[PDB]
């Protein structure tokens, strides 16, 4: 009837999820920047 909570999501997990995404997002920015993606091919 409420025996649910099979897998109520603990804030830690949302917290771990958020942290991982930001870390992936920080990696993505650095790699693209380093690649000059953000730089101009200005000839």
């Amino acid at each position: 009837g409420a025996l649910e909570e099979r897998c109520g999501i603990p804030i830690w997990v949302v917290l771990v999820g958020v942290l991982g995404g930001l870390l992936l997002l920080t990696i993505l920015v650095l790699a693209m920047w380093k690649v000059g993606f953000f730089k101009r091919n200005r000839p």
Binding site: R6, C7, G8, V14, V16, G20, G21, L24, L25, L28
Partner: protein, 44 residues
């Protein structure tokens, strides 16, 4: 059952949230570049 195991189920949500973060950041990144290109073209 041996499946209430909130590993897979938490895992689906932890991944789903993580994907969401990853996808918007990429969206934001493109939007930022798009505005920068326009400001740069816009001969003031």
């Amino acid at each position: 059952g041996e499946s209430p195991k909130c590993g897979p189920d938490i895992l689906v949500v932890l991944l789903s949230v993580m994907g969401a973060i990853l996808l918007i950041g990429l969206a934001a990144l493109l939007i930022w570049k798009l505005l920068i290109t326009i400001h740069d073209r816009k001969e003031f």
